[PDB]
């Protein structure tokens, strides 16, 4: 009937790994000394939890450790505009009352949740579906009215909006289906028989050379003379390709008093 | 001249390939380290071999060391070992913190008896000892705030209040207010 | 999915909801906190969440996963990488199925057709 | 209320607009006899929770304990 | 509609002795004639908006 | 021009507008339109600013 131990205990084999994140000699030496006497030291604290005993987190010197919150530009000013840039400093400075308040959720992520409908409203749905697969839809009016009567109105509005969302997500997934199953001009008339017997590895760096000159030793024996000769050959081909060039299009964002189009930005300023 | 290797191009005809080599070869800028060379660069000498980030052996060995206690076990043993721990809610799990934080008081009982003659010398000692406490307690005034202790995350965190739904929503969810600024109906 | 190195900051902000988070560019200043030597190309630092990933690999190669990787410069890179791909996965899904939530979308505030005005 | 999804302009409960206010109990015996503050320790779990232990007594006898 | 009308910036005089840079600079400024262009909204002064480049020193509370 | 083209989000309260469920019960079945995604807001001549 021994206490249960978590998987992390079998990795370290001890409950007292003195893990301090502060990388100063004073701190790590004391930790190494404390890590050795943890078995006969009354001033020992666990950092590996168990079923019978909780544990502390990672230590930062005498205080505790937590990573710097993921950079977030949202902030609220107090006295003057601080123009907070979370990318300008490595560690986030503490918020002073008269300077700044940071956004909520120092350690938070974006998820999707759902309210749980009331138990009595759920039971009316179970009775309707059950009476549906047994007696058919045409003989479930009373069970349907019990849903409209017992389920609070906010629940019915959730049920109404769910059907409208999944109708939206259905079309979005089918539009993606269309663009995916569209046959491009470079695959017209091609089937699975025209596919080559290659796998993912056959397209990697060992088999398919990247589009860089120093990925391997291909161009390592090239002399300057061979380069000057190649410049002459590429210029000869340009006597046939440079003959054409796209014509300049009109500027759609000429008027500054008009909502401009978010056209693709130029590669270079 | 062009050197051949295991990594090949992606062109069907040999003319497209030769055009690609002449294309890449026309952009090469040689930088030599030897004087008396038409292409000589004391500084800004470009390397001719590309670096590739790859997981080393020390990388792959430590990840395989994290799974060592599992390779000796079957899936049924893993579940019965680390997943299906027999429930036993009789332990004083929070004794770990009572011992740690209760030590400040026990340490104070010993430290308040320092034989330092000068009263103002012990003022410095208690000020130093208080600095150790305030790293956790934070606010020295009473009825103002709470201390800050970072604790380990285990399956038994909030084990006796998992049944309460409002405690989960208060701890986990930071709801986003809308233009119709009201609590959800 | 983002098919570029840059994205307009406003295109991932909410129009009818309070903005409590941004989707910032990769924090390049964290790359100079690594004390050891490493080779990094500038052509890989702007794409989302990848710089934090490469830094994590560099730290897992120089150090390991035990008692040497547990230093602030290396744990923040692992946390940023784990957090960047979680937010970007959520913003990407919200961009796919809830495009009307963001600024710049024409469905955030639909403009009526001329036949709806009665002229 | 902020965490629950309601942004808050201003502060306090002295509602400037069209809302009812609830001033603190006047510290005089007249109001101290009619009113008393809500003691949170008096909000309890319904004792019907203890009737679930009936399952335990029945399972023990079913298993021969 | 009330919020939108409220953002159309009003007219704020340039003359300012409260900001010491203008107290010095406006002594060397040349008042040139503003020829009427046929409108009633000629911004011949600065605008009463916190984000105006000539009014950012003014505190709008 | 920028403040003419500076709008606020969410517009006005939809619940204070005519409902579609009410028009159906009144004898007028509303028609559903699509968003006009092709129009670009622009400021008028300076005389109107």
């Amino acid at each position: 009937k021994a206490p249960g131990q978590i998987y992390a205990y079998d990795i370290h084999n001890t409950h007292y790994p003195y893990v301090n994140i502060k990388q100063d000699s004073q701190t790590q030496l004391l930790a190494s000394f404390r890590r050795s006497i943890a078995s006969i030291n009354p001033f020992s604290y666990r950092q590996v939890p168990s079923q019978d005993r909780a544990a502390f987190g990672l230590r930062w010197g005498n205080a505790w450790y937590a990573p710097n919150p993921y950079p977030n530009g949202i902030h609220f000013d107090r006295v003057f505009p601080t123009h907070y840039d979370p990318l300008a400093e490595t560690n986030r400075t503490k918020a002073n009352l008269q300077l700044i308040k940071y956004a909520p959720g120092n350690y938070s992520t974006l998820v999707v949740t759902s309210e749980k409908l009331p138990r009595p409203c759920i039971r009316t749905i179970q009775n309707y579906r059950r009476c549906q697969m047994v007696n058919g839809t045409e003989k479930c009016n009373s069970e349907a009215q019990d849903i409209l009567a017992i389920c609070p109105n906010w629940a019915l509005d959730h049920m109404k909006e769910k059907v409208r969302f999944y109708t939206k997500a259905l079309a979005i997934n089918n539009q993606t289906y269309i663009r995916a199953m569209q046959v491009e001009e470079y695959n017209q008339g091609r089937t699975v028989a025209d596919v080559a017997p290659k796998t993912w590895i056959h397209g990697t760096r060992q088999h398919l050379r990247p589009d860089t000159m120093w990925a391997d030793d291909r161009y390592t024996n090239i002399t300057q003379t061979e380069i000057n000769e190649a410049i002459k050959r590429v210029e000869a081909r340009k006597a046939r390709e440079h003959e054409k060039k796209p014509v300049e299009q009109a500027n759609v964002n000429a008027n500054t008093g008009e909502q401009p189009v978010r056209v693709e930005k130029s590669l270079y300023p | 001249p062009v050197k051949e290797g295991q990594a090949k191009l992606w062109f069907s005809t040999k003319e497209e390939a030769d055009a690609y080599d002449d294309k890449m070869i026309s952009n090469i800028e040689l930088k030599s380290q030897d004087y008396e060379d038409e292409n000589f660069s004391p500084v800004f000498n470009r390397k001719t071999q590309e670096y590739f980030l790859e997981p080393s052996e020390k990388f792959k060995s430590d990840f395989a060391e994290l799974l060592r206690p599992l390779r000796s076990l079957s899936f049924n043993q893993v579940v019965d070992r680390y997943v299906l721990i027999p429930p036993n809610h009789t332990f004083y799990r929070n004794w770990t913190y009572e011992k740690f934080l209760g030590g400040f008081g026990l340490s104070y009982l010993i430290l308040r008896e320092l034989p330092l003659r000068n009263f103002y010398a012990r003022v410095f000692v208690m000020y130093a000892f208080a600095a150790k406490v305030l790293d956790h307690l934070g606010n020295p005034f009473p009825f103002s705030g709470h201390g800050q202790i970072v604790a380990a995350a285990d399956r038994w965190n909030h084990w006796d209040v998992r049944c309460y739904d409002n405690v989960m929503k208060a701890l986990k969810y930071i709801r986003i207010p809308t233009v119709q600024n009201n609590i959800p109906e | 999915t983002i098919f570029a190195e840059t994205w307009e900051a406003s295109e991932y902000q909410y129009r009818n909801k309070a903005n409590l988070k941004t989707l910032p560019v990769n924090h390049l200043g964290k790359l100079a906190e690594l004390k050891f030597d490493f080779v990094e190309y500038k052509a890989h630092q702007l794409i989302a969440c990848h710089l934090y990933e490469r830094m994590t690999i560099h730290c897992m190669n120089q150090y390991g996963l035990f008692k040497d990787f547990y230093r602030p410069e290396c744990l923040d890179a692992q946390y940023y990488f784990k957090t960047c791909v979680e937010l970007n996965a959520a913003y990407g899904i919200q961009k796919k199925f809830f495009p009307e939530h963001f600024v710049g979308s024409p469905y955030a505030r639909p403009v009526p057709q001329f036949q709806q005005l009665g002229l | 209320t902020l965490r629950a999804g309601k942004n808050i302009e201003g502060s306090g409960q002295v509602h400037f607009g069209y809302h009812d206010q609830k001033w603190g109990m006047p510290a005089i015996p007249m109001f101290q006899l009619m009113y008393y503050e809500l003691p949170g320790n008096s909000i309890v779990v319904n004792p019907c929770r203890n009737q679930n232990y009936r399952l335990y007594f029945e399972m023990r006898k079913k298993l021969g304990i | 509609a009330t919020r939108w009308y409220g953002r159309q910036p009003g007219h704020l005089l340039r003359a300012d002795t409260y900001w010491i840079p203008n107290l010095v600079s406006q002594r060397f400024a040349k008042h040139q004639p503003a020829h009427w262009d046929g409108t009633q909204n000629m911004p011949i002064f600065r605008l009463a908006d916190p984000k105006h480049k000539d009014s950012y020193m003014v505190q709008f509370r | 021009r920028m403040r003419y083209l500076t709008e606020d989000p969410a517009g006005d309260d939809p619940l204070q507008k005519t409902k579609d469920e009410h028009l159906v019960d009144l004898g007028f079945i509303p028609k559903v339109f699509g968003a006009n995604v092709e129009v670009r807001k622009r400021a008028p001549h300076d005389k109107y600013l």
């Binding site: 505009p81 008009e258 401009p260 | - | 600024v103 | - | 105006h52 480049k53 020193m57 | 920028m2 606020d8």
Partner: peptide, 23 residues
């Protein structure tokens, strides 16, 4: 929802000057 929130349809450039925020 932030009270001082505005949706602008034309580009603006904000000055990065200490103690001041403006276009």
């Amino acid at each position: 929802m932030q009270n001082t929130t505005n949706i602008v349809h034309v580009p603006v450039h904000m000055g990065h000057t200490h103690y001041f925020d403006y276009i």
